[PDB]
Amino acid sequence: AQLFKPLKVGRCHLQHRMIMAPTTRFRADGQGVPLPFVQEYYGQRASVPGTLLITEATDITPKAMGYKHVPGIWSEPQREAWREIVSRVHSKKCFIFCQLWATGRAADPDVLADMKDLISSSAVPVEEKGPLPRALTEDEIQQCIADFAQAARNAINAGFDGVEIHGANGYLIDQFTQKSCNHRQDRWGGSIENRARFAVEVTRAVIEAVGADRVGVKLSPYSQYLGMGTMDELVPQFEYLIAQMRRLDVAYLHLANSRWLDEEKPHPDPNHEVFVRVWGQSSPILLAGGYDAASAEKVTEQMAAATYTNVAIAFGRYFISTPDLPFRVMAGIQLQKYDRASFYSTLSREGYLDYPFSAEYMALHNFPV
Ligand SMILES: Cc1cc2nc3c(=O)[nH]c(=O)nc-3n(C[C@H](O)[C@H](O)[C@H](O)COP(=O)(O)O)c2cc1C
């Protein structure tokens, strides 16, 4: 199976193409430091050598943090906690990218030090008022771009194999890409190229920091989560941005389906064919959102037959429920049914560390360490 073939992504020689998608689980402390057992969570999911894992979204600066109990990577205590997580993954011969974000208008205003700190590309709330975000100034944009680069340096210094730039799901970068939020009249909004500029410049600064082979970029072009996915020129806007990502030669593009607002409207393009076409055949593409063992297999096989041979699939919910997911899929073992109780848990070991391995995997584990 194509899905089981080794694939080089960035500097990492992956041994199969099933990826742990970035998933926020709120197991960080009030200082943004991952809890001491976060290392066992990622270690569990480093089940099979040559797996790539992508971390939960990680904050870049204390001012940009939008939630409590999510991790950052600006402070020394955070960076040391992540070094230990990354060490555990590498000890199991797996690879890990740190996903970097800022929440912008989707931050929890109760968590911000000042109401001034709720920022976006423009003063457009997610819901009809809705506390109003403040439009970033030119200098604040420049500062945010440098903060992403410095976070990327911190990540690479903690040992991460790479960073993913969180350009999706209506968070701050996507708030610049999409006209349903960005109504700026300066060079950061007001046309397809101008709206794309924020994502292009964050990407360029992170590339200068760590090199294109340690940077992936996530987008969710069709997603309607958090006020996105409604602009009239949605397709052209992302065709343009993905052409620029391809020109910048990033290690991978990651495209994900999210929450679709009306289930009676069919989705236009479940496997993102329209965008994969612009990205091209040569560089790895990660697809996420709604896949299972059979559909991950089918889409990778059929894309390969269509010349798109460099496709990986990332799983969020099944990697939560199934720590040995790639082992299971390769051995024809059923993935663990996931449950909403665990998705909506916070802080505890319960609903986090306590999904079992397959009995099969346990059978091979029957030895003294
Ligand atoms: C609990 C939960 C937390 C998530 N947190 C993030 C996040 O931190 N970063 C991000 O880019 N996507 C996040 N996602 C989206 C996942 O990466 C993925 O796109 C989503 O789970 C859909 O894929 P699935 O069908 O395999 O679950 C999250 C999803 C869930 C279920």
Side-chain angles (χ1 to χ4, degrees), residues 130-145:
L132 284 201
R134 173 180 74 73
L136 284 171
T137 60
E138 170 70 27
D139 293 343
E140 294 172 318
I141 288 168
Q142 298 293 339
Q143 186 62 51
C144 187
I145 288 164

mmCIF file of all heavy atoms in Angstrom, residues 130-145:
data_model
loop_
_atom_site.group_PDB
_atom_site.id
_atom_site.type_symbol
_atom_site.label_atom_id
_atom_site.label_comp_id
_atom_site.label_asym_id
_atom_site.label_seq_id
_atom_site.Cartn_x
_atom_site.Cartn_y
_atom_site.Cartn_z
ATOM 1 N N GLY A 130 -20.760 40.264 19.837
ATOM 2 C CA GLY A 130 -19.345 40.028 19.476
ATOM 3 C C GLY A 130 -18.372 41.135 19.874
ATOM 4 O O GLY A 130 -18.403 42.214 19.299
ATOM 5 N N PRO A 131 -17.508 40.899 20.875
ATOM 6 C CA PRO A 131 -16.535 41.972 21.166
ATOM 7 C C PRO A 131 -15.589 42.228 19.962
ATOM 8 O O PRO A 131 -15.196 41.253 19.274
ATOM 9 C CB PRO A 131 -15.768 41.463 22.400
ATOM 10 C CG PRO A 131 -16.198 40.080 22.626
ATOM 11 C CD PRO A 131 -17.492 39.839 21.891
ATOM 12 N N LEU A 132 -15.276 43.510 19.705
ATOM 13 C CA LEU A 132 -14.598 43.925 18.490
ATOM 14 C C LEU A 132 -13.101 43.755 18.609
ATOM 15 O O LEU A 132 -12.478 44.291 19.538
ATOM 16 C CB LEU A 132 -14.825 45.399 18.149
ATOM 17 C CG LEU A 132 -16.120 45.958 17.543
ATOM 18 C CD1 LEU A 132 -15.825 47.311 16.873
ATOM 19 C CD2 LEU A 132 -16.781 45.027 16.560
ATOM 20 N N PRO A 133 -12.503 43.020 17.658
ATOM 21 C CA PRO A 133 -11.063 43.031 17.779
ATOM 22 C C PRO A 133 -10.468 44.414 17.330
ATOM 23 O O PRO A 133 -11.168 45.202 16.716
ATOM 24 C CB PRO A 133 -10.612 41.886 16.871
ATOM 25 C CG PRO A 133 -11.691 41.575 15.959
ATOM 26 C CD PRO A 133 -12.997 42.142 16.580
ATOM 27 N N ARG A 134 -9.184 44.645 17.599
ATOM 28 C CA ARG A 134 -8.504 45.836 17.119
ATOM 29 C C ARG A 134 -7.609 45.446 15.930
ATOM 30 O O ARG A 134 -6.871 44.440 15.988
ATOM 31 C CB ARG A 134 -7.677 46.403 18.258
ATOM 32 C CG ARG A 134 -6.765 47.543 17.946
ATOM 33 C CD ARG A 134 -6.071 47.907 19.232
ATOM 34 N NE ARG A 134 -5.023 46.999 19.705
ATOM 35 C CZ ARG A 134 -3.825 46.886 19.147
ATOM 36 N NH1 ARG A 134 -3.525 47.549 18.003
ATOM 37 N NH2 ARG A 134 -2.928 46.099 19.711
ATOM 38 N N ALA A 135 -7.688 46.242 14.841
ATOM 39 C CA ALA A 135 -6.793 46.032 13.712
ATOM 40 C C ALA A 135 -5.306 46.241 14.016
ATOM 41 O O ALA A 135 -4.895 47.261 14.549
ATOM 42 C CB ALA A 135 -7.215 46.897 12.525
ATOM 43 N N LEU A 136 -4.472 45.279 13.677
ATOM 44 C CA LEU A 136 -3.033 45.411 13.987
ATOM 45 C C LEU A 136 -2.459 46.631 13.190
ATOM 46 O O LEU A 136 -2.938 46.917 12.072
ATOM 47 C CB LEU A 136 -2.254 44.152 13.555
ATOM 48 C CG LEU A 136 -2.404 42.900 14.470
ATOM 49 C CD1 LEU A 136 -1.759 41.682 13.796
ATOM 50 C CD2 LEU A 136 -1.795 43.183 15.891
ATOM 51 N N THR A 137 -1.437 47.295 13.742
ATOM 52 C CA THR A 137 -0.780 48.345 13.001
ATOM 53 C C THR A 137 0.331 47.701 12.190
ATOM 54 O O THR A 137 0.697 46.515 12.427
ATOM 55 C CB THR A 137 -0.092 49.355 13.927
ATOM 56 O OG1 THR A 137 0.889 48.657 14.694
ATOM 57 C CG2 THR A 137 -1.072 50.046 14.802
ATOM 58 N N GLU A 138 0.831 48.436 11.208
ATOM 59 C CA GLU A 138 2.020 48.011 10.478
ATOM 60 C C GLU A 138 3.141 47.491 11.453
ATOM 61 O O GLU A 138 3.738 46.463 11.233
ATOM 62 C CB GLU A 138 2.516 49.208 9.580
ATOM 63 C CG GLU A 138 3.882 48.994 8.940
ATOM 64 C CD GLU A 138 3.866 47.906 7.806
ATOM 65 O OE1 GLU A 138 2.813 47.716 7.195
ATOM 66 O OE2 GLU A 138 4.920 47.326 7.468
ATOM 67 N N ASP A 139 3.537 48.285 12.442
ATOM 68 C CA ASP A 139 4.624 47.833 13.286
ATOM 69 C C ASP A 139 4.284 46.538 14.066
ATOM 70 O O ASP A 139 5.178 45.716 14.297
ATOM 71 C CB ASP A 139 4.984 48.914 14.264
ATOM 72 C CG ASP A 139 5.591 50.140 13.581
ATOM 73 O OD1 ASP A 139 6.039 50.030 12.383
ATOM 74 O OD2 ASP A 139 5.554 51.216 14.215
ATOM 75 N N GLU A 140 3.047 46.421 14.526
ATOM 76 C CA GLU A 140 2.639 45.189 15.210
ATOM 77 C C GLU A 140 2.666 43.989 14.310
ATOM 78 O O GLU A 140 2.947 42.887 14.796
ATOM 79 C CB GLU A 140 1.251 45.307 15.833
ATOM 80 C CG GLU A 140 1.228 46.322 16.977
ATOM 81 C CD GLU A 140 -0.131 46.589 17.467
ATOM 82 O OE1 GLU A 140 -1.058 46.719 16.663
ATOM 83 O OE2 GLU A 140 -0.308 46.627 18.683
ATOM 84 N N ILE A 141 2.380 44.165 13.010
ATOM 85 C CA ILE A 141 2.493 43.045 12.049
ATOM 86 C C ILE A 141 3.933 42.623 11.911
ATOM 87 O O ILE A 141 4.258 41.419 11.952
ATOM 88 C CB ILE A 141 1.916 43.468 10.650
ATOM 89 C CG1 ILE A 141 0.385 43.536 10.803
ATOM 90 C CG2 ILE A 141 2.359 42.544 9.530
ATOM 91 C CD1 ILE A 141 -0.299 44.204 9.612
ATOM 92 N N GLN A 142 4.831 43.613 11.746
ATOM 93 C CA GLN A 142 6.244 43.305 11.657
ATOM 94 C C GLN A 142 6.736 42.549 12.900
ATOM 95 O O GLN A 142 7.564 41.610 12.814
ATOM 96 C CB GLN A 142 7.070 44.586 11.507
ATOM 97 C CG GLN A 142 6.779 45.395 10.231
ATOM 98 C CD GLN A 142 7.218 44.664 8.965
ATOM 99 O OE1 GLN A 142 8.062 43.762 9.016
ATOM 100 N NE2 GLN A 142 6.577 44.990 7.834
ATOM 101 N N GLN A 143 6.301 43.041 14.055
ATOM 102 C CA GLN A 143 6.658 42.360 15.317
ATOM 103 C C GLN A 143 6.121 40.902 15.372
ATOM 104 O O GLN A 143 6.853 39.982 15.808
ATOM 105 C CB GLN A 143 6.180 43.137 16.530
ATOM 106 C CG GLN A 143 6.686 42.521 17.872
ATOM 107 C CD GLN A 143 8.199 42.529 17.965
ATOM 108 O OE1 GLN A 143 8.846 43.576 17.752
ATOM 109 N NE2 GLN A 143 8.791 41.354 18.188
ATOM 110 N N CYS A 144 4.880 40.681 14.925
ATOM 111 C CA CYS A 144 4.306 39.318 14.931
ATOM 112 C C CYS A 144 5.086 38.394 14.039
ATOM 113 O O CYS A 144 5.361 37.247 14.404
ATOM 114 C CB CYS A 144 2.835 39.389 14.493
ATOM 115 S SG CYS A 144 2.037 37.808 14.674
ATOM 116 N N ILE A 145 5.485 38.890 12.864
ATOM 117 C CA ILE A 145 6.283 38.135 11.937
ATOM 118 C C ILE A 145 7.615 37.754 12.610
ATOM 119 O O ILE A 145 8.071 36.582 12.560
ATOM 120 C CB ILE A 145 6.579 38.985 10.660
ATOM 121 C CG1 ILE A 145 5.299 39.119 9.812
ATOM 122 C CG2 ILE A 145 7.672 38.276 9.741
ATOM 123 C CD1 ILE A 145 5.345 40.290 8.687
#
